[PDB]
Ligand binder design. Structure first.
Ligand SMILES: O=C(O)CCCCC(=O)O
Ligand SMILES: [Mg+2]
Ligand SMILES: [Mg+2]
Length: 263
């Protein structure tokens, strides 16, 4: 189920990573490799992860993307995708994000979890996930595809680490039993006014179902979710462009707010 040579996997990972590291867009890689498969793209993504680990970056988490019924159908896929989170992606509550290091960023409000027991697929279900959740973390993702004008496809997007670039944590980081992730209301304000809202159910019907799905996806490569993993479960709100000068505040029902400023 692969079409790339090893040399191509290595060179594509360099090419795609350089676009993020040097803040420029690129053509979608499937233009040059039309036969590229999901396994190829994940090969490329995991190689970019290796490149970052090799230079000393810690991988502090994983994210899930295309977690909407609408999102999957737009992309012609039947399942979500995942990507990894490097330590320098992390931004503190109330922090300042430098847009000069971003290409064409947008923000999404999400809910994250940190696990306290390993999770394995295949066949991981909602019931398997519950006790493995330590606590939840209100999180705003900054997504920033390295493909120009968002002219892409899901295979290219996987290869580009699912557009990951920054994430901002904040609010109250509470045990799972204190929080209903299905009914969790989230309100995104930008420049002083409400611009988007949503509920946790927008994530596959339940954000914990996204965690179960992630375990199953990882199992396809013989991987799993180790205890202690931070997982961003998916977009609760629609993605919103951000630019220098913007202030955002995202309010999480019963869990405070997450804020950031852009320059
Ligand atoms: O849902 C995500 O977090 C990944 C989205 C990747 C595609 C995009 O850049 O819009
Ligand atoms: Mg650089
Ligand atoms: Mg996201």
């Amino acid at each position: 189920n692969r079409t790339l040579t090893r040399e191509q996997v290595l060179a594509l990972a360099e090419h795609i990573e350089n676009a993020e590291l040097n803040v420029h867009d690129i053509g979608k890689v499937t233009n040059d490799f039309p036969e590229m498969t999901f396994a190829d793209a994940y090969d490329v993504q995991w190689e970019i992860r290796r490149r970052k680990e090799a230079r000393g970056n810690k991988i502090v988490g994983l994210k899930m993307g295309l977690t909407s019924w609408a999102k999957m159908a737009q992309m012609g896929v039947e399942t979500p995708i995942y990507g990894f989170l490097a330590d320098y992606f992390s931004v503190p509550d109330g922090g300042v994000v430098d847009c000069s290091k971003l290409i064409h960023p947008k923000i999404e409000a999400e809910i994250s979890v940190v696990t306290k027991a390993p999770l394995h697929g295949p066949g991981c279900h909602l019931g398997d996930v519950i006790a493995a959740i330590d606590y939840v973390i209100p999180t705003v993702e900054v997504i920033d595809s390295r493909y120009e004008n968002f002219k892409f496809d899901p295979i290219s997007v996987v290869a580009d680490n699912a557009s990951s670039t920054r994430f901002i944590t904040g609010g109250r980081m509470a045990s799972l039993e204190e929080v209903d992730l299905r009914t969790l209301g989230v309100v995104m304000e930008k420049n002083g006014e409400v611009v988007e809202l949503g509920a946790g159910a927008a994530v596959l019907g339940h954000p914990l179902s996204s965690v179960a799905m992630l375990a199953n996806l990882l199992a396809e490569r013989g991987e799993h979710i180790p205890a202690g993993t931070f997982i961003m479960t998916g977009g609760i709100t629609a993605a919103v462009p951000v630019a220098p000068g913007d202030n955002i505040t995202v309010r999480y029902q019963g869990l405070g707010s997450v804020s950031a400023r852009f320059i």
